[PDB]
Scaffold this active site. Sequence first.
Site, PDB file in Angstrom:
ATOM      1  N   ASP A   1      -9.527 -77.963 -34.962  1.00 12.21           N
ATOM      2  CA  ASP A   1     -10.191 -77.475 -35.813  1.00 12.21           C
ATOM      3  C   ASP A   1     -11.121 -78.591 -36.429  1.00 12.21           C
ATOM      4  O   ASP A   1     -10.731 -79.462 -37.200  1.00 12.21           O
ATOM      5  CB  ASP A   1      -9.296 -77.291 -37.230  1.00 12.21           C
ATOM      6  CG  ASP A   1      -9.917 -76.546 -38.428  1.00 12.21           C
ATOM      7  OD1 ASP A   1     -10.965 -76.390 -38.352  1.00 12.21           O
ATOM      8  OD2 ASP A   1      -9.039 -76.536 -39.419  1.00 12.21           O
TER       9      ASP A   1
ATOM     10  N   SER B   1     -29.407 -74.863 -39.672  1.00  9.97           N
ATOM     11  CA  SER B   1     -30.085 -74.069 -38.619  1.00  9.97           C
ATOM     12  C   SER B   1     -31.439 -73.539 -39.024  1.00  9.97           C
ATOM     13  O   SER B   1     -31.800 -73.491 -40.276  1.00  9.97           O
ATOM     14  CB  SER B   1     -29.101 -72.691 -38.441  1.00  9.97           C
ATOM     15  OG  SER B   1     -29.893 -71.680 -37.787  1.00  9.97           O
TER      16      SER B   1
END
EC number: 3.4.23.22
Length: 330
Positions: free
Chosen positions: A35, A199
């Site tokens: 994770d 992004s």
Amino acid sequence: STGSATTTPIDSLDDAYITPVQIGTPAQTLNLDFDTGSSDLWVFSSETTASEVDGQTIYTPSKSTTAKLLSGATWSISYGDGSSSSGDVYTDTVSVGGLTVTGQAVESAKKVSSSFTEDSTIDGLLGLAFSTLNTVSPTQQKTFFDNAKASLDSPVFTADLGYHAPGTYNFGFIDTTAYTGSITYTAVSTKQGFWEWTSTGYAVGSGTFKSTSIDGIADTGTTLLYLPATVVSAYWAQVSGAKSSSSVGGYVFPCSATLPSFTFGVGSARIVIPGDYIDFGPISTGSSSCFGGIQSSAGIGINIFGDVALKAAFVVFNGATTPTLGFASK
């Protein structure tokens, strides 16, 4: 040193991935959920409330000659899906894919929430976010990667998740046979303890690319792709009959639909998520309403590049002094 381990979807939807981990002496092999959105290595164990264990493989510290109680230390964690676990702490030897850390904090669950009990395939989590998020008290502990870092050939690990298929976590090296083209690297903020990046935009299907900054985290422990409501609306507007359902808890679409791809920007580069990756199947067995793999982050408080996005790429988690994230097509 390096390590290399295969990671396997737990079910036919790629809801999560499990990677075998050796703990203790002699080895006890548990299948853990790696994770990158959390920083605790915790396991089902011989100390877990019996009623809360159902099929998982447990760690038994008393059977390990290298296990030592970390006296006084406790842990307690809650995840973004509302699940939780808590317990005490041992140090022991932990190996992943041939890579060994001695003195790793192994957090032994006394309690787990029903979500964990109900998932027989996941024996625990192995956190790979930054150690500042580790919940051990009163002395915070380091992640497996942090402990391994100095011994690694290069201070990196890579995530190569498969679509309905196995993939690979590598530690300490970049497998140049595992991706196509070049790796585009992008800046990371550690300020919140996550692999947090920005992004450069998105496209829906064969549509034109929209240049816009989207701050989000690279999180292998989250199944889906969570993005701003504007973006997610633009995506699902291209699917006939798609709708946001408060009863179901997100966007659903007719199972007879063909989904468009979704493109996200990494600097000047582009990663394409095939439409099939965004299909998470009937909301309930036999239903003709299907659950979408792209959902709104509104009310999470953060955008999450979960498995839906990450499995479309070869992803480098660069833990150099100035950390960065790299993405390549594959």
